[PDB]
């Protein structure tokens, strides 16, 4: 059980070799914002919400994908102004195309996007342009209704349906800003 010691923010901890920065920051009581991360899914670092400043690293690193190395130093949005700026910018970019659907969205009140836009978001929109739009909702089965505009394209659904369950009957489809979770055609 080789334990690697590192300092997150000012404080120090020791965690099993291979533990991700986001897991360590969880263990020490620090809420790094995250959407695409999932403890039970292989890390993908897609949404870039969980950026943190790491000593010796020019770019911010996705805490969800940064394996802990010995003697590392990390400063989250609680102590790194640069990491704070990175996370807040990712949050803004995450909300520009998002529908103004909270009153009608079932996830309202339990939405990680809402909560982390409160904790790690700008007070108000800067986006005066036109939002991306999809026709919604669309059923991907008898049970599940998909609202693509609200999709932050984190790929957690797809990553679950591949890794956890061997059921890749949805996937990320199209490309660019138009990327969308989808079933094949009608299957």
């Amino acid at each position: 059980v080789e334990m690697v010691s590192l300092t997150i923010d000012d404080h120090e901890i020791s965690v099993p070799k291979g533990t991700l920065l986001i897991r360590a920051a969880e263990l020490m009581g620090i809420q790094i914002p995250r959407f695409c991360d999932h403890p039970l899914l292989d890390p993908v670092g897609a949404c870039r919400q969980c950026l943190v400043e790491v000593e010796g690293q020019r770019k911010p690193m996705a805490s969800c994908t940064t394996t802990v190395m010995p003697d590392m130093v990390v400063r989250t949005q609680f102590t790194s102004e640069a990491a704070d700026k990175a996370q807040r910018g990712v949050m803004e970019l995450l909300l520009i195309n998002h529908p103004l659907d909270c009153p009608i969205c079932d996830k309202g009140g339990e939405c990680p996007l809402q909560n982390q836009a409160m904790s790690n978001g700008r007070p108000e929109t800067r986006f005066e342009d036109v939002k991306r739009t999809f026709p919604k909702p669309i059923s991907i089965s008898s049970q599940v209704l998909l609202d693509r505009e609200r999709c932050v394209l984190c790929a957690r659904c797809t990553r679950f349906s591949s890794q956890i369950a061997g059921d890749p009957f949805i996937d990320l489809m199209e490309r660019g800003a138009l990327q969308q979770v989808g079933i094949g055609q009608d299957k």
Binding site: E26, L27, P39, R156
Partner: protein
Amino acid sequence: GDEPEIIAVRRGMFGNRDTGDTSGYGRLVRPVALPGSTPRPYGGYFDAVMDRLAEVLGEERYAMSIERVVVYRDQLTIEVSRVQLPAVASVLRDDPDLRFELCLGVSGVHYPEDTGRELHAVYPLMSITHNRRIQLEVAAPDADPHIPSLYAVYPTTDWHERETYDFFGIIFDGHPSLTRIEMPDDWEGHPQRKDYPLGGIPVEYHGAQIPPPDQRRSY
């Protein structure tokens, strides 16, 4: 110890009290710590107060009596040790340099998740002559909820100590008569404790009902 008191340990993000409505967000462990002891140069008159207190009490008596000193939002809390409460209160009231004539009451607060320190009685004291005020805090366990009553020093506490008992079960030993003041003498339980259920009833509606707030979900 100088480590803070953790009254609760939040698990997961978004304040979920249980498993949580989205998967993968429940792994955070955030202890709910009250402020720890202030380092030393307490702001304003606080030092002037505490130093004076430390002078009137001995070094040994002061160390055995005052468990902690916490300045928060420019408010001074003296986490006093149980048993020694009457002596400290007498010193505060009588000493001309402290002269906290006015004890404003006693308030119980229940921290079931604070081991051995479940029930805290808070004594707001004010010194009119010196225009000062502080808050004593005495922590008692749930299994031994006994605290020394301040009646001989602050008669005003008699009713407060009673209400606090009625609402928390904090047994102020030495109080003339700890009879329930708010609730009926035959009432079972101490309502302001967290273990006591809110005791509401569903609100009725045509074809439905809303359970009380303590049953429905919260964050």
